[PDB]
Paper text:
In the Gram-positive pathogenic bacterium Clostridium perfringens the conjugative tetracycline resistance plasmid pCW3 is representative of a large class of closely related toxin and antibiotic resistance plasmids. In this study, we have identified TcpK, a protein encoded by a gene upstream of the oriT site and tcpM, as being a major factor required for the efficient conjugation of the pCW3 plasmid. Our data revealed that TcpK was a distantly related member of the wHTH family of DNA binding proteins. Our data suggest that its function is to decorate the origin of transfer of pCW3 and to interact specifically with sequences that are only present in this region of the plasmid.
To complement these biophysical experiments, we determined the structure of TcpK in complex with the 23 bp region derived from oriT. The asymmetric unit of the crystal contained four TcpK dimers (termed A:B, C:D, E:F, G:H) bound to four 23 bp dsDNA molecules. Superposition of TcpK to its DNA-bound form does not reveal any significant structural changes to the protein (Global r.m.s.d. of 0.40–0.9 Å). However, the DNA molecules have undergone a subtle, but noticeable, twisting induced by TcpK binding. Unexpectedly, each TcpK dimer bridges across two strands of DNA. This result is in contrast to any other known wHTH protein, where the dimer arrangement permits interaction through the canonical helix with palindromic sequences on the same DNA strand. Comparison of the TcpK/DNA complex with these wHTH/DNA assemblies reveals that TcpK interacts with DNA through a novel binding mode. Here the β-wing (β3–β4) sits within the major groove while the canonical helix (H3) only makes a single DNA contact through R60 to the phosphate backbone. Additional residues making contact with the DNA are all located outside the canonical helix. These interactions are through the loops N22-K31 and E69-N73, and, in particular, the sidechain of R28, which stretches into the minor groove. Additionally, the protein makes hydrogen bond interactions with the inter TcpK box bases (-CAG-).
Residue numbers in the entry:
A (entry chain A), B (entry chain B), D (entry chain C): 2 to 101
C (entry chain D): 2 to 100
Write the structure that this text describes.
Amino acid sequence: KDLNLYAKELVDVVNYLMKKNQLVFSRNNKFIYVNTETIKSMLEKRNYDTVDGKLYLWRELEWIECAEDRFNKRIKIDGENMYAVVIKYSSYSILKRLYL
Amino acid sequence: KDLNLYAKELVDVVNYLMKKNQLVFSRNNKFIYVNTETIKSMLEKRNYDTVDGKLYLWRELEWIECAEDRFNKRIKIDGENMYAVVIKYSSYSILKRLYL
Amino acid sequence: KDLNLYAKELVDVVNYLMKKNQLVFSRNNKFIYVNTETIKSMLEKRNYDTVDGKLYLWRELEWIECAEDRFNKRIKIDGENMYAVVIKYSSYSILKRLY
Amino acid sequence: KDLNLYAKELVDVVNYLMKKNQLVFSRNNKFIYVNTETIKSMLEKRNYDTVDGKLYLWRELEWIECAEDRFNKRIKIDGENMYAVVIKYSSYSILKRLYL
DNA sequence: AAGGAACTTTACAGGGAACTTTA
DNA sequence: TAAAGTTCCCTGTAAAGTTCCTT
DNA sequence: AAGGAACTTTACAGGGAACTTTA
DNA sequence: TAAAGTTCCCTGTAAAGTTCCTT
């Protein structure tokens, strides 16, 4: 039920990977690319909901950009294609402001 | 500090105006048009944040459709132009569901 | 002699079981699974029509998805097969929005 | 609001055109084809809602079969194509049984 | 008719290859 | 003017969704 | 912010021709 | 089959939806 749990996690995940210089930005800096496995591992810790439950809510509330039927989208870094979990910077920025 | 207060207010504002029959809908029924002065009066009551503070978070989380650096939007009803605060019905339904 | 009695009952039944957490959703969240016995017990209360009379109208107006000669369809929850009364979320939504 | 007004109209319209022999059936007899103009003229009479308001509700509740972004669909009678308002016979049949 | 068993689809996971868009 | 961003093709998988088949 | 004016889109309306499905 | 049923091409329109631009 409690929405802060999901919002706090999104901010915490981005803050953690930002410190551990483990996050990449889109060309326009409007999006954050995170590895699907890293994010799914970090979401396993807090047992308020399942990893898929957290990603469904993030997708539905449009805090992450997904492809049809998936929790991630195709990206290109240094001419190589891969899948990444794409977090909207705009969604991270207020949620962070709210808890700052 | 509590994201639920903002989400509960959005649902409560829509529920209040729905009972008092004061809602206008978009052609596709995907959006709710509310008078700017009305929402700004209703948002004055609960003192967890300022009216502008509440509208900034609603805009940033994309629960309302606005024009760049405004909380308002231009609409058209019976050939006449006016400004309304435009609430996404999808955002209202997702949030009402998440609390009941 | 009133379609609203059937319509309002569908919304009321879904609202009741949603609060009491006795509702399960399909994978795509397009359908609501309800136990055949629970729904048949709840439909006994309001005497405007019989339980089978209410389920016939719900089926015919396609507010519920049914198998051939029944008012329930086969479902699967955690690899186990069973029969449930399957309510279209679409129907529930539109009807809820009417009132 | 009063759903009976919409249901009673659907049954009344089909009953009227059935007597005046202005009804055509699908091959499987599961659908009723009515001329778009005739039905829109008949829906003008009872002022509880607009013609477009009545057809939106009929479409939503799936009492009529429509094409994407329309209140009618393409049909074929004796090798000739035309557009008709297609009423589900199943929808007409309970709505009629309820009110007899 | 009722339900155990078995077949089909889906919603998540992935990639090669080539196209379109942007700084 | 080249790399990001996207789009069109596919594959893999476990459980949901559905149908077969027996009683 | 407010509002005149003018642009673009959408959800309704139509049809010829050709494709897919059914008796 | 051969006609029903459907889809793929297109066009037209008025008002909603949006943007431009000035105050």
